[PDB]
């Protein structure tokens, strides 16, 4: 399986409308070698996908959001499921690849009463603690603290990419517009301007928060090249017996 194999089938996989969903497993299968993917916990916390694949013959751990289930929202179960897999992959020198399409964290009274804060902190911890190479591709959505907990550039990530359909924002257009303009009574034009300016991957690009806005066809090739270079990555951290996981 050549490392520079193109995947044109991904050029239109993300629907134009933000209301329709897609299967991230199709993206994973297209990107990886021989379309072979060993999924971990395939029937539990299905709004996140974790598994083992191979890129250019090298074992890679893959974590991604599943827009089919819960629209990709993070919750307690998905947070723990992703966190333990990421920690294992870090502990045994396995590169991580992340596919990001996340609207935020699942709301509700049950999530708060169950301690969603602790488990979201678990996933954020696991991603920030990793010293193995990390590659991230944002497909459609990255809103709020969720965007930060999905291996952003700012958690000492290595390479971050955005598809042309990606969008990075503090929060949704409606809430941002209603909170910026409390008493403007011109929500139409304000929302139009906000979605024209900040509903696209350019605000994160101009600040350098993503390396490039890549075409979806080149994804696999790009990733392979990165995994060739970051194979010798070494970082140094302060000494400690161990750390305090938010468990």
């Amino acid at each position: 399986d050549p490392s520079d194999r193109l995947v044109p089938e991904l050029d239109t996989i993300v629907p134009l409308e933000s209301t329709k969903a897609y299967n991230m497993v199709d993206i994973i299968h297209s990107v990886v070698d021989e379309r072979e993917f060993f999924e971990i916990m395939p029937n539990y916390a299905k709004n996140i996908i974790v598994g083992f694949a191979r890129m250019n013959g090298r074992t890679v751990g893959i974590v991604g959001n599943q827009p089919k289930v819960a629209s990709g929202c993070l919750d307690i179960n998905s947070s723990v499921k992703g966190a333990r897999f990421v920690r294992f992959c870090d502990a045994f020198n396995i590169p991580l690849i992340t596919f990001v399409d996340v609207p935020g964290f699942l709301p509700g009274t049950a999530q708060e009463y169950g301690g969603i804060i602790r488990h979201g902190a678990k996933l954020l911890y696991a991603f920030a603690e990793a010293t193995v190479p990390k590659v991230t591709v944002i497909t459609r959505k990255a809103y709020g603290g969720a965007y930060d907990v999905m291996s952003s550039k700012h958690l000492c990530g290595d390479t971050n990419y955005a598809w042309p359909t990606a969008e990075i924002a503090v929060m949704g257009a409606k809430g941002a517009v209603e909170i910026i303009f409390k008493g403007h009574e011109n929500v139409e034009a304000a929302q139009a301007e906000y979605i024209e300016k900040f509903a696209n991957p350019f605000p994160a690009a101009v600040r350098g928060f993503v390396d490039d806005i890549i075409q979806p066809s080149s994804t696999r090739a790009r990733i392979c090249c990165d995994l060739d270079v970051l194979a010798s990555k070494k970082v140094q951290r302060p000494w400690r017996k161990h750390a305090n996981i938010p468990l």
Binding site: E9, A21, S71, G108
Partner: protein, 673 residues
Amino acid sequence: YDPNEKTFDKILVANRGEIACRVIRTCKKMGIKTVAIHSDVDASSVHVKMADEAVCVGPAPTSKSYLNMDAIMEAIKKTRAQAVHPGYGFLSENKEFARCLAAEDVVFIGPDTHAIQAMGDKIESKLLAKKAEVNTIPGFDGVVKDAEEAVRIAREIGYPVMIKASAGGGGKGMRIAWDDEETRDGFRLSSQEAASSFGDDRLLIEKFIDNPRHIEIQVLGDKHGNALWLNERECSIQRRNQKVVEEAPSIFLDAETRRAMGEQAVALARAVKYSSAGTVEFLVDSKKNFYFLEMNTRLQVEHPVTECITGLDLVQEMIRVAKGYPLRHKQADIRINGWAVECRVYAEDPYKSFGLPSIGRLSQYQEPLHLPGVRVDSGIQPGSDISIYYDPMISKLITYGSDRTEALKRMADALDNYVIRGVTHNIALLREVIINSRFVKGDISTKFLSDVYPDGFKGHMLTKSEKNQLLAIASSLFVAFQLRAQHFQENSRMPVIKPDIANWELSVKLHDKVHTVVASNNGSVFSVEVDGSKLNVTSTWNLASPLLSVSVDGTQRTVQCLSREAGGNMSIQFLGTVYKVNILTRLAAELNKFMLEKVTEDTSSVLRSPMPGVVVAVSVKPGDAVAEGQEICVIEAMKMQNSMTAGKTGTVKSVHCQAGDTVGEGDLLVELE
């Protein structure tokens, strides 16, 4: 292809799919700016990107996207294109579209309105054909009004009776009555759905031809009163009265009968005063007697197969004729060159009624362009999806050769090297058709699939030698995968020592039989003993390529490995048909005998909604005979609508949840058993 002659500056293509791509390609090769139309869904189709300019026309459904006439008028208004080409279907056979475009300034590539109206209804068509001194199918002039009149007419027109519906298409309102009671009740029922189907409420009772061969004649005309016949074509292998495999020359027809049919077609075209490309369809019995039946006032779908034997670009001729120039070729310039055969690749399952339309998205798609004598017409690319709003057409595969056998061999090779992953196609049925003994001999008819597969398409029945070759290839592939699994990189801390196993003893379960296989490797060559029969399989063993070429005992074969599992299951496409095999090691096969075969409850009835939100709509209703794998009750979310599907197969028990249901992390939903 001389660009010196003045030609239309811009043509709007009012179509979609493979024909739009074809006309855009032939316009680009002729140095003409092209403008394409599309719906919202087909915003990234091949023809849109290949065309110079694109115009969105409407929503997804065809009734508001490509059948929306005023949208086409406004599109041509802004685009100010000189001409419009309708391809086939859609608006190619609508008088009022042609009239309204020709009113202001727009020239139409095709026939005139009066010609379409004349050959638009079967009554006038048959009347003028009789006036055109050509052979016509026996029958009663006019349309019968009462069943008593129909059964009275059936007495003197032959005991076999057939009923057809006036106008329309797609083989609707058509069937056969054999008895007087059959005649009367069939006429009553046909009158019953006459209004529902087309609304003409006009029916035809006449004689049914037994063992018919459908033979097409390609006629070309201009505005200077010149008509030519471009040989013939044979379109007989049909299911649901729709052609799938068709051949440029017909072995049945000799020179004299072909000349007679061509002259009759030219005379009919002159009588109707045709001034473009068209096709005239005849039915031929076993006695070389041809009866006229309808002619198409548009480009034919199977036109490319007759271009290879003649070397003429039909769309180029249509464009030049619409410009006004006369034909540059005489009847002596029309000749048969070689042979040509072409098949239609659909997105349908050939194991159900010889094809049932299916939907999906193409994950992988590769066409066999590199093979000799192969041409592909398709508007499909990797990532395209087969919707429910359009024809399930995927591709048209054309092959040409010096004679029939070479064309058939090239077509079989092309079908073996053609990669489609994401949907289900009918390539198995096509490759069975092209290698059938009757088809090779040529004793075919419109009832080919009805009697060749009386019980329906069952797949490919493979002989003992083919079964041995398939088992050998599967075993060699299994061993090659196992051997590739052992090739790590050097560790220098814990060295890896490869196992010294020399012979692999395998148990291979195929269909309902278990075979014992002994496989040995000698580098790039595998010696495989299947039940005491020795075979030698050699290949490059590239396990990542979708197509694998192997050689079994000198016989070259091309197979695909669609699926593979650690448990031994593997699906391999061999000779165009997908076989499922289970390969285990001998020890694992022995141990498998202790595994209790488990029953499946198969009562998934508690599938929940993902989000604790509310419902937005209900897709289905209790008891709608929907099984599994389709929308039941879609959900709304903070952003994304949840395409909630069904559970187990069967008939939906009940749907209770209504739009706007406040749910606490999940929702009881569709129930099956």
